[PDB]
Amino acid sequence: MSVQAEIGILDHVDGSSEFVSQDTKVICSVTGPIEPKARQELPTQLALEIIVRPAKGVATTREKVLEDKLRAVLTPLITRHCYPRQLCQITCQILESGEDEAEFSLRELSCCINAAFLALVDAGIALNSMCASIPIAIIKDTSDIIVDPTAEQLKISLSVHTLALEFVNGGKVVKNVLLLDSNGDFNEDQLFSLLELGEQKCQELVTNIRRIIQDNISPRLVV
């Protein structure tokens, strides 16, 4: 689809990014590697402190689950063994949810994944591969698989899915499925039609993410 993003917007963190998919908007900060707390210390590899803040109100367990799912995507993306006994602060501040927060959170999760990835890119932390996340929904009576669904489409969605894939070799090889979070009523035949079209639009996003990363980092360096 069409997404807009920025890189390096905050001054007091090692990496920052802003990601906007339709109406969802997340700003993300990354600080690492830094000295970890005693409770957080890991001898062999890097420890991650992942924080997600809601667009309204204080943090509830709803964001604690988004923090857990976000960790599931980011942890295999970071070359943690390069920074033994260190800490990384990935903080996500959701600005506009782009969805009815009462019922849905997949747009925020998919945007936090991309924003966290971009902020980790801006922070210069070792990454094994690339990553892109898309939200998908299957609409009620039409039974169509709408990639990057609007907030109005989600209201009449019978199932909602977040797909985040691990990309390698110029964003053309799918190294793994980092997270697939499916919720609602669906069958096996629907699921694989979803994963097929989802991988296609995911491959479109890394190609767009590669373009945005290059437009932001290339003027910073010398050729």
């Binding site: 007091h12 924080i51 309204k56 943090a59 903080t91 501040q93 506009e96």
Partner: protein
């Protein structure tokens, strides 16, 4: 986690203040330029002061008024800190020294002052009223969190518009924005916070018993200036020549008249800021009516 300041840096910045120099090129009485950005939704406002960045989000839900104040709506402000503004902040410690003080200042400046007309939030006298909420997100810290929050909250409350509601006795029908247009909030006054940072170029003995007071005062300190200051004073005013609240909790003892001249100093600034906020709102409204003609 602590911010280590080198001895060469502590001496240079303080010696530059004695030479009437500020690192960011400002003067001692110069408040930073306030940049206010409005989002697509009403109540989405982003304030910037040099490098300091804050964001506020106004929201409202229908709730029941307290039995003690049955003709009154509800209003609360949230200012939880996150490591995004800098690794110096612990994740959501709402009990730290600076976190508690700064929160009580914003509460006393906006909530306690009655800047929001809580009587207009009341829907029906016995039950049903509006419960407004102002959430502040500190994105980037370069000092002046108190002053930035006060501007962000007020700009949000004024920009915010609550949805129109029609009551059928006990039936409260909350109309969506597509059905009927929303109505704005009632603002009784616009309080603005100006924070003075004090620097003692001499000893503590010359401050308690000294004849000539030599303490340096600057307005709206940066992060480096804030970390080196010996005292702080947060004063809140509105264009009605009202001192909304003043907070000088401990620190470097200051001459009373010096603090009084700070209050009068700040009134010149809160006039510039109040008129600036109202102008950016008028410009934002004219932009939406220009797209209403194109639609």
């Amino acid at each position: 986690k602590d911010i280590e300041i080198s001895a060469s840096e502590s001496k240079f910045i303080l010696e530059a203040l004695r030479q009437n120099y500020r690192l960011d090129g400002r003067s001692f009485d110069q408040f930073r330029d306030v940049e206010i950005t409005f989002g697509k939704e009403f109540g989405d406002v982003s304030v910037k002061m040099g490098n300091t960045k804050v964001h506020c989000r106004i929201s409202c839900q229908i709730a029941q008024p307290y039995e003690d104040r049955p003709f009154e709506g509800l209003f609360v402000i949230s200012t939880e800190i996150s490591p995004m503004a800098g690794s110096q902040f612990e994740n959501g410690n709402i009990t730290g020294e600076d976190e508690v003080l700064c929160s009580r200042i914003i509460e006393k400046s906006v909530r306690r002052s009655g800047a929001l007309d809580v009587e207009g939030l009341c829907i029906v006298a016995g039950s049903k009223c509006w419960a407004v909420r102002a959430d502040v997100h500190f994105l980037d810290c370069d000092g002046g969190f108190i002053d930035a929050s006060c501007i962000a909250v007020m700009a949000g409350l004024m920009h915010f518009k609550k949805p129109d509601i029609t009551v059928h006795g006990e039936q409260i029908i909350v109309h969506p924005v597509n059905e009927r247009e929303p109505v704005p909030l009632g603002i009784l006054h616009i309080p603005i916070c100006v924070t003075f940072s004090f620097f003692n170029p001499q000893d503590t003995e010359e401050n308690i018993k000294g004849e000539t007071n030599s303490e340096i005062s600057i307005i709206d300190a940066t992060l480096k200036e804030e970390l080196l200051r010996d005292g702080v004073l947060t004063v809140t005013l509105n264009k009605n020549r009202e001192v909304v609240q003043v907070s000088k909790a401990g620190g470097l003892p200051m001459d009373a008249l010096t603090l009084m001249k700070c209050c009068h100093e700040a009134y010149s600034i809160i006039e510039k800021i109040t008129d600036q906020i109202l102008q950016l709102l008028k410009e934002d409204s004219e932009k939406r009516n220009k797209y209403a003609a194109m639609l």
